[PDB]
Amino acid sequence: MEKSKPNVVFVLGGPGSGKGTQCANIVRDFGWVHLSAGDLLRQEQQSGSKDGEMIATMIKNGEIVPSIVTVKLLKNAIDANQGKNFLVDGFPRNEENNNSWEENMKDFVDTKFVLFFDCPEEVMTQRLLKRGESSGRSDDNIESIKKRFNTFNVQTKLVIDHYNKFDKVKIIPANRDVNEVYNDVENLFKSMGF
Ligand SMILES: Nc1ncnc2c1ncn2[C@@H]1O[C@H](COP(=O)(O)OP(=O)(O)O)[C@@H](O)[C@H]1O
Ligand SMILES: Nc1ccn([C@@H]2O[C@H](COP(=O)(O)O)[C@@H](O)[C@H]2O)c(=O)n1
Ligand SMILES: [Mg+2]
Protein backbone atom coordinates (compact mmCIF):
# COMPACT_ATOMS: atom_id res chain seq x y z
CA MET A 1 0.00 0.00 0.00
CA GLU A 2 3.16 2.04 -0.14
CA LYS A 3 3.99 2.95 -3.77
CA SER A 4 6.87 0.78 -5.12
CA LYS A 5 10.07 2.47 -6.22
CA PRO A 6 10.71 2.20 -9.97
CA ASN A 7 12.81 -0.64 -11.37
CA VAL A 8 15.63 0.71 -13.51
CA VAL A 9 17.61 -1.09 -16.20
CA PHE A 10 20.68 0.65 -17.60
CA VAL A 11 21.02 -0.04 -21.31
CA LEU A 12 24.58 0.15 -22.56
CA GLY A 13 26.52 -0.74 -25.67
CA GLY A 14 28.66 1.10 -28.17
CA PRO A 15 27.34 3.94 -30.35
CA GLY A 16 24.87 2.49 -32.84
CA SER A 17 24.68 -0.90 -31.14
CA GLY A 18 20.89 -0.62 -31.14
CA LYS A 19 20.02 0.65 -27.67
CA GLY A 20 17.36 3.15 -28.74
CA THR A 21 15.90 0.72 -31.27
CA GLN A 22 15.51 -2.12 -28.76
CA CYS A 23 14.31 0.18 -25.97
CA ALA A 24 11.37 1.29 -28.15
CA ASN A 25 10.34 -2.35 -28.50
CA ILE A 26 10.50 -2.85 -24.71
CA VAL A 27 8.39 0.29 -24.17
CA ARG A 28 5.88 -1.12 -26.66
CA ASP A 29 5.62 -4.61 -25.21
CA PHE A 30 6.28 -3.95 -21.51
CA GLY A 31 5.15 -0.42 -20.81
CA TRP A 32 8.45 0.79 -19.34
CA VAL A 33 9.49 4.43 -19.86
CA HIS A 34 12.50 4.85 -22.14
CA LEU A 35 14.97 7.53 -21.05
CA SER A 36 17.81 8.11 -23.52
CA ALA A 37 20.32 10.25 -21.64
CA GLY A 38 21.76 11.50 -24.96
CA ASP A 39 18.26 12.46 -26.13
CA LEU A 40 17.64 14.36 -22.89
CA LEU A 41 20.96 16.15 -23.36
CA ARG A 42 20.05 17.09 -26.95
CA GLN A 43 16.75 18.44 -25.60
CA GLU A 44 18.45 20.42 -22.86
CA GLN A 45 20.64 22.19 -25.39
CA GLN A 46 17.69 22.54 -27.81
CA SER A 47 16.01 25.35 -25.94
CA GLY A 48 19.05 27.22 -24.99
CA SER A 49 19.93 26.90 -21.32
CA LYS A 50 23.17 27.97 -19.72
CA ASP A 51 24.55 24.46 -20.26
CA GLY A 52 23.25 24.36 -23.81
CA GLU A 53 26.34 25.27 -25.78
CA MET A 54 28.54 23.19 -23.49
CA ILE A 55 26.40 20.17 -24.36
CA ALA A 56 26.62 20.94 -28.10
CA THR A 57 30.46 20.96 -28.02
CA MET A 58 30.85 17.83 -25.92
CA ILE A 59 28.33 15.79 -27.97
CA LYS A 60 30.06 16.75 -31.22
CA ASN A 61 33.32 15.56 -29.64
CA GLY A 62 32.06 12.35 -28.05
CA GLU A 63 32.76 13.66 -24.54
CA ILE A 64 30.78 12.86 -21.42
CA VAL A 65 28.88 15.89 -20.10
CA PRO A 66 29.24 16.76 -16.39
CA SER A 67 27.03 14.37 -14.39
CA ILE A 68 25.25 17.16 -12.49
CA VAL A 69 23.55 18.03 -15.77
CA THR A 70 22.69 14.51 -17.01
CA VAL A 71 21.60 13.04 -13.67
CA LYS A 72 19.40 16.07 -13.02
CA LEU A 73 17.65 15.52 -16.37
CA LEU A 74 17.17 11.81 -15.66
CA LYS A 75 15.91 12.52 -12.15
CA ASN A 76 13.40 15.12 -13.33
CA ALA A 77 11.96 12.76 -15.96
CA ILE A 78 11.78 9.91 -13.45
CA ASP A 79 10.04 12.04 -10.82
CA ALA A 80 7.45 13.11 -13.42
CA ASN A 81 6.54 9.47 -14.05
CA GLN A 82 5.50 7.95 -10.73
CA GLY A 83 4.52 4.29 -10.83
CA LYS A 84 6.55 3.52 -13.96
CA ASN A 85 9.73 1.51 -14.55
CA PHE A 86 12.60 2.98 -16.57
CA LEU A 87 15.04 2.01 -19.28
CA VAL A 88 17.96 4.35 -18.70
CA ASP A 89 19.64 4.27 -22.09
CA GLY A 90 23.28 5.27 -22.57
CA PHE A 91 23.97 5.88 -18.88
CA PRO A 92 26.17 5.42 -16.90
CA ARG A 93 29.00 6.02 -19.38
CA ASN A 94 31.76 6.54 -16.84
CA GLU A 95 32.55 6.37 -13.13
CA GLU A 96 31.39 9.93 -12.45
CA ASN A 97 28.01 9.11 -14.08
CA ASN A 98 27.65 6.04 -11.85
CA ASN A 99 28.67 7.74 -8.61
CA SER A 100 26.30 10.63 -9.26
CA TRP A 101 23.45 8.22 -9.96
CA GLU A 102 24.23 6.35 -6.72
CA GLU A 103 24.35 9.60 -4.73
CA ASN A 104 21.13 11.10 -6.16
CA MET A 105 19.01 8.02 -6.87
CA LYS A 106 19.94 4.80 -4.97
CA ASP A 107 17.45 5.66 -2.22
CA PHE A 108 14.67 6.08 -4.78
CA VAL A 109 14.99 3.26 -7.34
CA ASP A 110 15.79 -0.44 -7.64
CA THR A 111 18.43 -0.69 -10.34
CA LYS A 112 18.17 -4.22 -11.49
CA PHE A 113 20.85 -4.85 -14.09
CA VAL A 114 22.77 -3.47 -17.05
CA LEU A 115 21.51 -4.68 -20.42
CA PHE A 116 24.56 -4.68 -22.67
CA PHE A 117 24.33 -4.93 -26.44
CA ASP A 118 27.56 -6.31 -27.82
CA CYS A 119 28.40 -5.34 -31.41
CA PRO A 120 31.51 -4.98 -33.61
CA GLU A 121 32.75 -1.40 -34.06
CA GLU A 122 32.86 -1.94 -37.84
CA VAL A 123 29.14 -2.77 -37.83
CA MET A 124 28.39 0.17 -35.51
CA THR A 125 30.20 2.58 -37.87
CA GLN A 126 28.07 1.41 -40.83
CA ARG A 127 24.82 1.79 -38.86
CA LEU A 128 25.78 5.30 -37.73
CA LEU A 129 26.81 6.51 -41.20
CA LYS A 130 23.43 5.13 -42.34
CA ARG A 131 21.57 6.85 -39.47
CA GLY A 132 23.60 9.95 -40.33
CA GLU A 133 21.98 10.30 -43.78
CA SER A 134 18.74 11.36 -42.04
CA SER A 135 19.25 11.86 -38.28
CA GLY A 136 20.67 15.37 -38.37
CA ARG A 137 22.62 14.36 -35.24
CA SER A 138 25.83 16.38 -34.92
CA ASP A 139 27.74 13.20 -33.99
CA ASP A 140 26.82 10.84 -36.86
CA ASN A 141 29.92 11.59 -38.95
CA ILE A 142 33.14 9.54 -39.05
CA GLU A 143 35.14 12.12 -37.05
CA SER A 144 32.61 12.12 -34.20
CA ILE A 145 31.99 8.36 -34.45
CA LYS A 146 35.61 7.38 -33.78
CA LYS A 147 35.76 9.81 -30.82
CA ARG A 148 32.66 8.12 -29.46
CA PHE A 149 34.37 4.72 -29.75
CA ASN A 150 37.43 5.89 -27.81
CA THR A 151 35.25 7.32 -25.00
CA PHE A 152 33.24 4.08 -24.81
CA ASN A 153 36.44 2.05 -24.81
CA VAL A 154 38.36 4.11 -22.24
CA GLN A 155 35.58 5.19 -19.83
CA THR A 156 32.51 3.03 -20.35
CA LYS A 157 33.86 -0.56 -20.54
CA LEU A 158 35.18 -0.14 -16.96
CA VAL A 159 31.62 0.58 -15.72
CA ILE A 160 30.24 -2.52 -17.46
CA ASP A 161 33.15 -4.48 -15.93
CA HIS A 162 32.21 -3.10 -12.51
CA TYR A 163 28.60 -4.28 -12.77
CA ASN A 164 29.72 -7.67 -14.07
CA LYS A 165 31.69 -8.14 -10.81
CA PHE A 166 28.33 -8.35 -9.06
CA ASP A 167 26.63 -10.41 -11.73
CA LYS A 168 24.54 -7.44 -12.82
CA VAL A 169 25.21 -7.55 -16.58
CA LYS A 170 23.00 -9.32 -19.15
CA ILE A 171 24.71 -9.50 -22.53
CA ILE A 172 22.73 -9.72 -25.75
CA PRO A 173 24.83 -10.02 -28.92
CA ALA A 174 23.53 -7.43 -31.34
CA ASN A 175 25.26 -8.31 -34.61
CA ARG A 176 22.06 -9.72 -36.12
CA ASP A 177 18.72 -8.62 -37.56
CA VAL A 178 16.71 -6.34 -35.23
CA ASN A 179 13.96 -8.98 -34.68
CA GLU A 180 16.46 -11.69 -33.82
CA VAL A 181 17.97 -9.34 -31.25
CA TYR A 182 14.58 -8.33 -29.90
CA ASN A 183 13.45 -11.94 -29.63
CA ASP A 184 16.23 -12.37 -27.09
CA VAL A 185 15.48 -9.04 -25.38
CA GLU A 186 11.80 -9.93 -24.99
CA ASN A 187 12.66 -13.37 -23.64
CA LEU A 188 15.07 -11.78 -21.16
CA PHE A 189 12.56 -9.30 -19.73
CA LYS A 190 9.94 -12.07 -19.37
CA SER A 191 12.42 -14.39 -17.63
CA MET A 192 13.26 -11.47 -15.29
CA GLY A 193 9.59 -11.18 -14.38
CA PHE A 194 8.77 -7.95 -16.21
N1 LIG B 1 20.01 -5.06 -35.22
C1 LIG B 1 20.23 -4.02 -36.06
N2 LIG B 1 20.63 -4.28 -37.33
C2 LIG B 1 20.76 -3.24 -38.19
N3 LIG B 1 20.45 -1.97 -37.98
C3 LIG B 1 20.12 -1.73 -36.70
C4 LIG B 1 20.02 -2.66 -35.71
N4 LIG B 1 19.65 -2.06 -34.54
C5 LIG B 1 19.53 -0.81 -34.86
N5 LIG B 1 19.84 -0.53 -36.16
C6 LIG B 1 20.03 0.79 -36.82
O1 LIG B 1 21.26 1.33 -36.38
C7 LIG B 1 21.17 2.72 -36.20
C8 LIG B 1 21.57 2.95 -34.76
O2 LIG B 1 20.56 2.41 -33.88
P1 LIG B 1 20.16 3.10 -32.51
O3 LIG B 1 19.13 2.33 -31.86
O4 LIG B 1 19.90 4.51 -32.72
O5 LIG B 1 21.51 2.94 -31.68
P2 LIG B 1 22.09 3.43 -30.26
O6 LIG B 1 21.02 4.06 -29.55
O7 LIG B 1 22.73 2.30 -29.57
O8 LIG B 1 23.18 4.51 -30.63
C9 LIG B 1 19.75 3.14 -36.53
O9 LIG B 1 19.65 3.58 -37.88
C10 LIG B 1 19.02 1.83 -36.36
O10 LIG B 1 17.82 1.79 -37.19
N1 LIG C 1 25.45 9.51 -19.95
C1 LIG C 1 25.63 10.24 -21.08
C2 LIG C 1 25.01 9.95 -22.25
C3 LIG C 1 25.18 10.61 -23.38
N2 LIG C 1 26.18 11.65 -23.44
C4 LIG C 1 26.47 12.49 -24.59
O1 LIG C 1 25.47 12.36 -25.62
C5 LIG C 1 26.14 11.87 -26.77
C6 LIG C 1 25.12 11.06 -27.54
O2 LIG C 1 24.65 9.92 -26.73
P1 LIG C 1 23.70 8.81 -27.34
O3 LIG C 1 24.43 8.17 -28.45
O4 LIG C 1 23.43 7.75 -26.26
O5 LIG C 1 22.44 9.49 -27.71
C7 LIG C 1 27.28 11.05 -26.16
O6 LIG C 1 28.24 10.69 -27.11
C8 LIG C 1 27.83 12.08 -25.19
O7 LIG C 1 28.47 13.15 -25.87
C9 LIG C 1 26.71 12.01 -22.20
O8 LIG C 1 27.57 13.06 -22.17
N3 LIG C 1 26.43 11.35 -21.06
MG1 LIG D 1 20.55 6.12 -28.93
Swiss-Prot record:
Its main location: cytoplasm. One of its GO terms (molecular function) is ATP binding. Binds 1 Mg(2+) ion per monomer. The Mg(2+) ion binds to water and substrates. Its cofactor is Mg(2+). Residues 130-140 are annotated as: LID. Its EC number is 2.7.4.14. Disulfide bonds: none annotated. ATP binds at residues 16-21, 131, 176. It catalyses: CMP + ATP = CDP + ADP; dCMP + ATP = dCDP + ADP; UMP + ATP = UDP + ADP. Residues 36-65 are annotated as: NMP. InterPro entries: Adenylat/UMP-CMP_kin (IPR000850), Adenylat_kinase_CS (IPR033690), P-loop_NTPase (IPR027417), UMP_CMP_kinase (IPR006266). Keywords: ATP-binding, Cytoplasm, Kinase, Nucleotide-binding, Nucleus, Pyrimidine biosynthesis, Transferase. Monomer. Belongs to the adenylate kinase family. UMP-CMP kinase subfamily. Catalyzes the phosphorylation of pyrimidine nucleoside monophosphates at the expense of ATP. Plays an important role in de novo pyrimidine nucleotide biosynthesis. Has preference for UMP and CMP as phosphate acceptors. NCBIfam families: UMP_CMP_kin_fam. This is UMP-CMP kinase. The gene is pyrK.
